[PDB]
Design a protein around this nucleic acid. Structure first.
Ligand SMILES: [Zn+2]
Lengths: 147, 134, 80, 165, 64, 645, 127, 22
RNA sequence: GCCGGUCCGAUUUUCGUGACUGGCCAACGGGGCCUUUCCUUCUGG
RNA sequence: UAGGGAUCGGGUGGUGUUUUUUUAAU
């Protein structure tokens, strides 16, 4: 991701495909951990996009109220992801119904700079723009604890 | 101080619910000018008579240049004439009763604010110089 | 409290002042009114600043006020 | 028929025939299109497959093209289908001509924002964005608008509407 | 090239003005289809909607 | 370098010389510097000296454009057309394939490792592209087996490199070399690279990329020119892969060439039907030039060369029939050309030509005539190809099936059994008698009401151009000449009738009144001048001169000036109507002045007529001056400035 | 006041507070090309010039990397054999940071200034 | 409604013309 | 680069090549032309 | 350095009681 998202493989010096919605830059990407052919990204139109390489096309797009910094899929659900944005709460979306963020982890004071799932599939690590990291559980919505 | 002003929009064209021609606005404003009305009053009576925003948008130019083009120019500009009228009115009231020391203060302030604008108008030379408020 | 200083929520921009937004603009609308005396239409500003009068039968349309002017109780209007 | 006759061709005579066939369907155009005045029309290929025809108006008469825009577009859109018809005016300068043909390119009105953002690499990107009006119609011809504006001035301008799209 | 408009909509009417079996040939030539495509972004929006439908249909395998 | 970065920079504007034309430089330069001994090496060497350090895709693509300019220069060149520098193409192939305790240190920033440990491969890729384009330009001169048998191991090596730009050249080179014949080594190489392009279709998730498209062209060449095809199921897979890509662009010429290739090569596949359906809809509904044409080519090739059943053979035919009613002007033209190909190359023609003529008649009654003229040409080809029964049913439909019925019958008789045509012409003569009667009189009354239908009239004029029946029709056409297009057609018909077949004085009076009260106006002026020159002879000539005086808007004025200059015993039977030219002694004013000077270029009687006209004008001016002096207005003589301004 | 100095004071004290997106109301093409070259050096993130006709506003999505920007209000001529003195007098080190000068291409820093071998006047420093 | 008797060039020409005449 | 054609040989379709032809498509560059519309204001005689 | 509550003057919107209705006002 860059000006628009590109798809390479390591046998070509040129991009194999170009997969944007419009001419809007894309801040971060992430593939799955299973059902690997789909992926998600986040661009500075405050927007979450999904893509599917099997159809080789973008597939849906939501727009939140602030810019999503870092997305991260779940390595045990394969259709849930967490989403870390500049309003101080990491949302947790279900893919096949993107109208409701089915959880919101709501304990920081500044921008939520990164999140990741643990490979056991239920704990969230997050790290803020303020000088602190937090660990959440998925099933609660507040902070378990803080380093 | 405080802010209280118009907010002229981002568009710069006739707002497309307009259902009236361009030279009709010119005829309307020269009609009000031959009635003898000041340009700011032309502007508000054109905001409310028929739905223009202002003449720089609906016509090709501003009302001052369109009245100079139609030959109904003012010999002194609006703010200059209005400050002169306020100055002579407060001078007449003070000469009716000289005890109004606040009116003396305000006459000094209006004299200062009109000599500032007279300095600007002489240094830009749009009125003939030697003009120095009688 | 903590919003993007680019394009905010439309509720928030309609909340705040007409000068303090990103691209300032009007909040007065032009509206067309039907003169109840002779049933014709004329345009009138929201914050009308003058008692506007119909061209057919100059009865009255809106007595001016500080903000919006009060339409005169027989007139039928539409925003435009 | 009623075009300037310095360089006629088939499609502009066809759309003048569309004009006088609207005149044959008489009872609404009460001599209002008799002051029509062309300068030139021109077809332009776009990236959407289709084409956009730009009709020029000499601009004492862009306010003459006043209430006739919507009705004659929906007339010639069923007459000469699957094109996109746009009227334009023409003539320290020429940026005024650029954004004036933009402002009369979109509609008689309704642009509300020019944004330009600058990425970290160095690529500028310049968005113009409409307000909210008739979006269910104007969504169809948005790629043709940026295509013909890029063809007409070389500036890379991307169009946008403040909505979900 | 001699283009008089004639105000006529008489395809089926011009077919149905003669004896038998000419209407049989006219019914033998009758499809009435193949409309015009939509613009590019609307065609893109509709087929990426269809792609979303098949991607949710795919991960509903993982739903169980 | 520095001049290039200042040129491609934005903030340096105000010059005409800094638009720089930088590559016609070498395009003209290697037309002369091609000694091909040392100076071409000094071309290539500073490219390597700048290429060893670092590069961007910006400088990479303009460098590749520069080497493209070198290659078109070598093809335009004529110093190396015979094998002297294939040594150097082989040469380019062979050149492609404790201690610091006292050491002082400043400049804390380190060395970026990215410099050349790839970018040597960038050099190798790009002058591999250069040399393979060199070989593909020497294909223009010769294709010799024993001069590049020693090249083919480097060719398969650079194919198995897969650094995109070399694959784009090598697939083109194998496309040109598939016509030739090397040995079993080439059999292995050709089957290997066919497997290679099948692999790149398998891994590339789009066929609308330039590599996959040109590889599809190479698969077309491998199908077309070999002894050994392969893998029915794999070509079925690659065609199922190319199938959904047909809509979106950047796919067109190469994949459609592959389609045409295998549909010519006759193999039966279940997916060819699906791509035939989609390419038929593409042929009708496409929006780019010649793509509808090549899709029409492949759809016609499938529809003729392959074997469908009754349901498909009915439904595609009615698809064409109602695809005639498509709203465009060019998709309609392409389906017209499809029906044209079906017509030119039948029992299906006997089954389809009745409804085809009916639908082309509806397309003639459709929109603005660039499709209607093609419909007329296709209907002419169909009516010429019809043996007896299609023409019989067509004559029945034209004689049975208001104003559209009459116009269809008239156009059918204009196109094309002369006895049945005579019976139809009797019906047409009855229709023309009932039509051309007092409608022209009411039209002349409308013209008089101005300066105080026409579909059946133009149909009757076309029918009279098609066909004492000629005498009665000539009288009816004289009545019809007695709205502007109708008068034009009637003036053409009157000139033709007066050529083919007082009464002629009355015809001249009607023609003069029609020209008085554009190209047909010129032809009518020519016909009236011919009638007056063929000419109560003196009374008719005097009436003609008086009609020219009453004539002398802009077109008829130029025709009157041309007729006066062509008409004027040098002056004895000429001195009647020079007063209008004496009165003629803003572009209409310029044309009238040019025609007046031409007529004045074209003796004693001339001075007499000039004196008489000047005296009559002086007497008129004297009468007007006396009327003003005795009636003495200024508002009507001064308001012209206010009206003009 | 000086619009460039007040703009750079705005992003400087907003970074000192610790915000992320800073609005910057009075804009000009000098500030545009200024923080364009500082985002080339990656000292802020992306930004945006919202264009209304009166002045245009600036919003910068700076991440964390500034610690002090600023200008020098006498924009005097500075020779090529004096930018080393000015770097030693303005920055805490030689290559740590930059100083951007107005020159005959215009918003180059001192590394690009010694590369292109031009100079001019000093308008601002950033590190 | 609230016209001025001054402030326009043609009106002050008319006023000085009336003063010149009578 | 696409396509049609005059041909030689096979054919009564279609292909190999050598010529040669035009209908068109993109990339290059060259020469002009329209964007100084047709009409009023210089430092001094 | 920033945040919050209340009040005075003006404006916008809401929708309950004070108000009331063909005299004007708001
Ligand atoms: Zn009324």
């Amino acid at each position: 991701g860059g000006a628009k998202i590109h798809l390479w493989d390591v046998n070509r010096l040129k991009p194999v495909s170009d997969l944007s919605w419009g001419a809007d830059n894309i801040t971060s990407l992430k593939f799955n951990q299973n059902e690997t052919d789909i992926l998600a990204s986040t661009g500075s139109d405050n927007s979450i996009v999904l893509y599917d390489l099997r159809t080789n096309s973008p597939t849906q797009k939501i727009v939140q109220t602030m810019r999503t910094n870092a997305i991260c899929w779940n390595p045990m659900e394969a259709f849930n992801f967490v989403t870390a944005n500049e309003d101080h709460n990491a949302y947790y979306y279900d893919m096949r119904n993107l109208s409701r963020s089915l959880n919101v982890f709501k304990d920081h004071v500044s921008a939520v700079m990164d999140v990741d799932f643990s490979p056991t599939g239920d704990e969230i690590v997050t790290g803020s723009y303020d000088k602190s990291i937090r660990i959440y559980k998925t099933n609660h919505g507040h902070s378990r604890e803080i380093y | 101080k405080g802010i209280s002003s118009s907010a002229i929009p981002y568009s710069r064209n006739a707002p497309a619910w307009f259902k009236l021609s361009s030279e009709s606005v010119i005829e309307q404003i020269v009609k009000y000018a031959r009635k003898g009305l000041t340009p700011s009053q032309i502007g508000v009576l054109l905001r409310d008579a028929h739905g223009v925003t202002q003449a720089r948008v609906i016509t090709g130019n501003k009302i001052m240049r369109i009245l100079k083009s139609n030959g109904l120019a003012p010999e002194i500009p609006e703010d200059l004439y209005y400050l002169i009228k306020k100055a002579v009115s407060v001078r007449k009231h003070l000469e009716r009763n000289r005890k109004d020391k606040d009116a003396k203060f305000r006459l000094i302030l209006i004299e200062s604010r009109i000599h500032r604008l007279a300095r600007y108008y002489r240094t830009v030379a749009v009125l003939p110089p030697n003009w120095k408020y009688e | 409290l903590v919003q993007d200083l680019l394009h905010p929520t439309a509720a928030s921009e309609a909340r705040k002042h007409k000068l303090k937004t990103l691209v300032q603009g009007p909040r007065s609308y032009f509206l067309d009114v039907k003169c109840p005396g002779c049933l014709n239409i004329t345009t009138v500003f929201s914050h009308a600043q003058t008692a506007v009068t119909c061209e057919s039968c100059s009865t009255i349309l809106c007595t001016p006020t500080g903000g919006k002017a009060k339409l005169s109780e027989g007139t039928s209007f539409r925003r435009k | 028929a009623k075009i300037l006759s310095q360089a006629p061709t088939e499609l502009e005579l066809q759309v003048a025939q569309a004009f006088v066939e609207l005149e044959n369907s008489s009872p609404e155009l009460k001599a209002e299109l008799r002051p029509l005045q062309f300068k030139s029309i021109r077809e332009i290929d776009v990236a959407g497959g289709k084409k956009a025809l730009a009709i020029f108006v000499p601009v004492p008469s862009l306010a003459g093209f006043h209430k006739v825009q919507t009705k004659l577009t929906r007339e010639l859109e069923k007459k000469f289908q699957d094109r996109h018809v746009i009227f334009l005016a023409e003539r320290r300068t020429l940026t005024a001509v650029h954004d004036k043909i933009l402002e009369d390119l979109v509609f008689p009105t309704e642009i509300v924002g020019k944004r330009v953002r600058y990425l970290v690499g160095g690529n500028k990107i310049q968005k113009v964005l409409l307000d909210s009006k008739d979006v269910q119609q104007i969504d169809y011809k948005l790629e043709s608008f940026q295509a013909v504006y890029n063809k007409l001035t070389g500036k890379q301008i991307v169009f946008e509407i403040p909505s979900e799209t | 090239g001699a283009s008089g408009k004639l105000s006529l909509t008489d395809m089926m009417n011009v077919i149905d003005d003669r004896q038998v079996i000419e209407n049989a040939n006219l019914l033998k030539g009758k499809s009435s289809t193949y409309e015009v495509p939509l613009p590019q972004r609307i065609q893109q929006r509709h087929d990426r909607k269809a792609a979303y439908e098949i991607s949710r249909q795919e991960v509903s395998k993982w739903n169980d | 370098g520095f001049a290039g970065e200042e040129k491609d920079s934005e903030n340096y504007h105000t010059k005409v010389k800094e638009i720089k034309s930088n590559k016609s430089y070498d395009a003209g330069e290697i037309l002369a510097s091609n000694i091909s001994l040392t100076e071409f090496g000094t071309l290539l060497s500073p490219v390597k000296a700048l290429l060893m350090v670092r590069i961007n895709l910006r400088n990479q693509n303009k460098l590749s454009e520069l080497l493209r300019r070198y290659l078109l220069g070598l093809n335009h060149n004529s110093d190396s057309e015979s094998e002297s520098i294939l040594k150097f193409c082989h040469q380019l192939f062979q050149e492609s394939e404790k201690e610091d305790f006292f050491l002082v240190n400043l400049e804390s920033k380190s060395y970026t490792i990215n410099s050349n440990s790839l970018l040597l491969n960038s050099t190798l890729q790009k002058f591999a592209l250069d040399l393979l384009r060199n070989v593909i330009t020497r294909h223009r001169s010769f294709l010799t087996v024993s001069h590049l048998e020693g090249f083919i191991p480097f060719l398969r090596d650079s194919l198995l490199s897969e650094n995109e730009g070399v694959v784009i050249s090598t697939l083109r080179i194998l496309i040109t070399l598939i016509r030739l014949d090397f040995s079993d080594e080439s059999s292995e190489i050709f089957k290997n690279c066919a497997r290679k392009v099948l692999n790149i279709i398998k891994v590339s998730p789009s066929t609308s990329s330039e590599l996959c498209q040109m590889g599809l062209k190479f698969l077309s060449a491998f199908i077309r020119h070999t002894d050994s095809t392969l893998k029915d199921t794999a070509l079925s897979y690659v065609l199922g892969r190319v199938l959904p890509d047909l809509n979106e662009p950047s796919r067109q010429g190469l994949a459609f060439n592959f389609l045409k290739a295998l549909v010519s090569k006759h193999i039966m596949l279940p997916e060819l039907y699906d791509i035939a359906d989609t390419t038929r809809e593409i042929m009708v509904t496409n929006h780019s030039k010649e793509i509808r044409d090549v899709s029409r080519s492949v759809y016609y090739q499938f529809l003729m060369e392959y074997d469908q059943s009754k349901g498909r053979l009915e439904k595609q035919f009615k698809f064409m029939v109602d695809n005639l009613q498509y709203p465009t002007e060019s998709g309609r033209q392409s389906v017209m050309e499809l029906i044209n190909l079906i017509i030119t190359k039948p029992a299906l023609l006997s089954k389809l030509s009745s409804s085809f003529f009916l639908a082309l008649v509806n397309v003639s009654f459709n929109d603005d005539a660039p499709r209607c003229r093609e419909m007329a040409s296709v209907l002419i080809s169909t009516m010429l190809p019809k043996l007896e029964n299609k023409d019989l049913e067509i004559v029945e439909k034209y004689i049975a099936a208001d104003n559209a019925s009459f116009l269809n019958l008239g156009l059918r008789t204009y196109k094309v059994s002369i006895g049945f045509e005579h019976t139809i012409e009797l019906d047409e003569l009855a229709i023309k008698r009932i039509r051309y009667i007092l409608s022209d009189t009411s039209v002349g009354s409308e013209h008089q009401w101005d300066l105080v239908f026409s579909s059946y009239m133009e149909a009757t004029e076309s029918v009279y151009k098609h066909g004492w029946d000629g005498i009665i029709t000539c009288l009816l056409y004289p009545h019809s000449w007695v709205a502007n297009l109708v008068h034009q057609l009637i003036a053409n018909k009157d000139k033709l009738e007066i050529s083919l077949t007082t009464i002629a004085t009355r015809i001249l009076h009607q023609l003069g009144a029609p020209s008085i009260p554009a190209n047909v106006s010129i032809k009518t002026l020519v016909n009236i001048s011919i009638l007056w020159k063929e000419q109560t002879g003196e009374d008719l000539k005097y009436t003609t001169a008086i009609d020219y005086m009453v004539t002398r808007g802009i077109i008829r004025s130029d025709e009157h000036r041309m007729d006066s200059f062509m008409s004027k015993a040098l002056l004895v039977q000429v001195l009647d109507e020079d007063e209008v030219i004496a009165e003629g002694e803003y572009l209409e004013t310029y044309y009238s002045r040019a025609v007046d000077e031409e007529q004045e270029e074209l003796l004693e009687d001339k001075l007499q007529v000039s004196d008489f006209t000047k005296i009559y004008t002086a007497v008129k001016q004297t009468v007007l001056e006396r009327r003003k002096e005795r009636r003495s207005a200024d508002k009507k003589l001064r308001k012209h400035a206010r009206s003009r301004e | 006041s000086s619009v460039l100095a007040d703009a750079l004071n705005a992003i400087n004290n907003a970074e000192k507070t610790g915000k992320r997106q800073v609005l910057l109301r009075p804009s000009s093409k000098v500030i545009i090309k200024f923080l364009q070259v500082m985002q080339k050096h990656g000292y802020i993130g992306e930004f945006e010039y919202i264009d209304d006709h009166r002045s245009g506003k600036i919003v910068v999505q700076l991440n964390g990397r500034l610690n002090k920007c600023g200008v020098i209000s006498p924009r005097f001529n500075v020779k090529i054999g004096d930018i080393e003195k000015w770097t030693a007098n303005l920055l805490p080190a030689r290559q740590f940071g930059y100083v951007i000068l107005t020159t005959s291409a215009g918003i180059m820093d001192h590394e690009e200034a010694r590369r292109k071998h031009v100079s001019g006047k000093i308008l601002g420093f950033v590190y | 409604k609230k016209a001025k008797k001054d402030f326009y060039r043609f009106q002050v020409r008319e006023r000085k013309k009336q003063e010149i005449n009578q």
